[PDB]
Amino acid sequence: EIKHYQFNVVMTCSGCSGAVNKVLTKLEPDVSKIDISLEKQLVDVYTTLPYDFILEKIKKTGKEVRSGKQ
Amino acid sequence: AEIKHYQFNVVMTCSGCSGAVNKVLTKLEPDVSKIDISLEKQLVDVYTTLPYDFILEKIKKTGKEVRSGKQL
Amino acid sequence: AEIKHYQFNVVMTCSGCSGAVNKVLTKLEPDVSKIDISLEKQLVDVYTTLPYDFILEKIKKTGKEVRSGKQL
Ligand SMILES: [Cu+2]
Ligand SMILES: [Cu+2]
Ligand SMILES: [Cu+2]
Ligand SMILES: [Cu+2]
What we know:
The first copy, chain A, has 70 residues and is an alpha+beta fold. Chain A has a single domain (1-70), classed as Alpha-Beta Plaits (2-Layer Sandwich). Chain A contains 2 helices and 4 strands. Chain A has helices at residues 14-25, 51-59, and strands spanning 3-9, 31-37, 42-47, 65-67. A 4-stranded antiparallel beta sheet of chain A has the order 2-3-1-4, covered by helices on one side. In chain A, a hairpin with a 4-residue loop joins β2 and β3 (42-47). Chains A and C meet through α1 of A and α1 of C. Bound molecules: copper (II) ion (CU) (4 copies). One copper (II) ion binds next to α1 of chain A.
């Protein structure tokens, strides 16, 4: 069953937000929906996959993850 | 009253880096009378009545590394 | 004589990051004869007489992460 996670990630330019998009996009179709706002610095993910698995994938980009939740 | 001149050597690699610093500083008008950011020289010059530390902390909320700062 | 070819996987996120890498390596001309940088593939190709670990260090100094490096 599809779960919903939201991370608060420090993204400064459109390259930062693109980099996060990129790694989530590789997880399609297990990620069914991606929604990112540079300006509010938020990342929303709809997937079947574990929080912990998505937390790591996103930090791998080297962008600071301030906070998470489900 | 007195306008202080501060310089920061801030790690800034694209114009997002430098724009994010810019944005936090412009928020502090009317107490900032001049902001000179040079993305090319990785320098941030601020003229302001505010104390150094308060300015420093506003810059660091961007997440960009501040290599050094000084009051001129 | 040898003109050596090095390839590094470097975490370049926007064209500021790749441009930061390009600038450190163009400061090494003409010892560096050719530079091909691929933002897309995250790769930096250097043709040079300088030794491998000297080029590696220069790229590290930019602060962008180097995942891997090799001589071909
Ligand atoms: Cu950028
Ligand atoms: Cu960026
Ligand atoms: Cu940047
Ligand atoms: Cu960048």
